[PDB]
Design a protein around this ligand. Structure first.
Ligand SMILES: O=C(O)Cc1noc2ccccc12
Ligand SMILES: O=C(O)Cc1noc2ccccc12
Ligand SMILES: [Mg+2]
Ligand SMILES: [Mg+2]
Ligand SMILES: [Mg+2]
Lengths: 273, 274
């Protein structure tokens, strides 16, 4: 039950690292960089960074090895939200009570700040001073993030959602892309940064990540009340959240104690209110 | 011309490689991928791919080694235009007589297709089957593209441009804008081709960078001239023309010592100023 403290450590660390990325290299770029900062440094909970750090630790790596991975996944996350808020998409004036970037600045600046954040996520992984892994591991991290962030993962999920009656299978297809791909990548990138990845471990961590990404979405529908409770019934939806947590924990069977943060996070997701 | 034939070879080759990237992996993604395809496969001249291929050859590499580089720079270019056409940006309904992507599909789909194109540019460079360089070189290619494409390069240029509305820019400020908005990506195209050669060294990279700096500006000056806060408005038409010639001269001088395999870059520099 120190998942809260684990979250707070991960957030403080990744926040410091992210904040350092938003220094305009010349004066004409100051507003752009302020918009980028405003779009990331918004008191978010940094679950994706948490996942990168915890995955790294689950395989025995010191967590600071995952700092670039943590930044990269948060940058992809933050850029996706800026675009999602835009009037052509979700058209939100607020995000967690605060003006969205296109309201605080302007629409063009929001489109562009977020574009710059996506490039920066890749920059941060390719940079061998910030991400000092073996070169082949850096490339695999970049590969995985590009596939997860793009039109076959996250962006694809946004298009599926836009394009959606819907049965359970199709709802799951959507979530698996829209949020699952980047959750799985956060876990995968942290695991790579451990220096101890092995195929069987990576697979197990992927099963974990698939289960939790879904658990979160089921539990969120439950807390709200074409949703998991409408589809399954409220009480069966609650049962399914438990089954997902269980699948997550079973995927971690045989991992050492250093995987406890991942176990605790899986419980936390279904125990929240 | 020799440069016309060179351009045509580069355009055929990169187009074939790009066209293969737009197969939706499942049916729910079809429309997204059609929008991606629509945004790239639009008969563009592929100057950034030409620069990658020509820079590669200038250093003695077989040009197919630059295929990934060529695709990646064109994907960045393409995505940038999709966002730039949107109603909050330049609000353009047409590009060369054809509907822009938000007009052909819708604004959200355009935003997302181009988002996916940016990712894909990085995917192609990081994929060691598509971009089979030494791993350290792949990482440098990715680094250089990310910096050129981002808030310190291309995206930065777009922001300088929006921050300059209603301000009379002098030549120095106009050049700062152009260097970021278009120069960064042109310089990266040349640099990534050079890296793909397998023969890059610091001296030759620096000289190619000087060449790319000159031709990137020459393109903009010449474009303003052909149209006739622009280069002709600032300088007068005749002095703008003289400057385009000076820029071509700087480009040709930067290629001092290069072998005949650099002739494509020399011929391009002349071509630009027509
Ligand atoms: O358990 C808690 O009190 C809050 C918390 N713990 O772990 C978290 C992870 C993400 C978001 C919130 C949390
Ligand atoms: O902060 C978030 O993006 C939502 C979130 N809060 O807790 C999560 C767990 C898994 C996936 C997502 C979450
Ligand atoms: Mg829901
Ligand atoms: Mg236009
Ligand atoms: Mg002009």
């Amino acid at each position: 039950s120190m998942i809260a403290a684990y979250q707070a450590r991960c957030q403080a660390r990744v926040d410091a690292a992210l904040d350092a990325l938003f220094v305009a290299p010349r004066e004409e770029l100051q507003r752009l960089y302020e918009a980028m900062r405003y779009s990331v440094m918004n008191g978010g909970k940094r679950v994706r960074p948490l996942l990168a750090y915890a995955a790294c630790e689950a395989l025995g790596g010191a967590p600071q090895r995952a700092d670039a991975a943590a930044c990269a996944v948060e940058l992809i996350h933050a850029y996706s939200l800026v675009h999602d808020d835009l009037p052509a998409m979700d058209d939100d004036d607020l995000r967690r009570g605060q003006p969205t970037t296109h309201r605080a600045f302007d629409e063009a600046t929001a489109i562009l700040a977020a574009d710059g954040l996506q490039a920066l996520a890749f920059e941060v992984l390719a940079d061998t001073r910030r991400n000092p892994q073996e070169h082949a591991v850096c490339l695999e991290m970049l590969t995985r993030l590009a596939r997860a962030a793009g039109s076959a993962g996250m962006v694809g999920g946004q298009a599926i959602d836009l394009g959606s009656a819907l049965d359970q299978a199709a709802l799951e297809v959507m979530h698996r892309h829209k949020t699952g791909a980047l959750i799985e990548a956060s876990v995968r990138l942290g695991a790579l940064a451990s220096g101890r990845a092995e195929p069987a471990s990576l697979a197990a961590l992927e099963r974990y990540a698939e289960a939790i990404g879904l658990a979160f979405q089921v539990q969120d529908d439950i807390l709200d009340v074409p949703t998991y409770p409408a589809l399954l019934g409220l009480e069966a939806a609650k049962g399914y959240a438990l089954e997902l947590r269980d699948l997550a924990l079973a995927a971690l069977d045989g991992f050492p104690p250093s995987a406890d943060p991942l176990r605790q996070l899986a419980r936390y997701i279904v125990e929240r209110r």
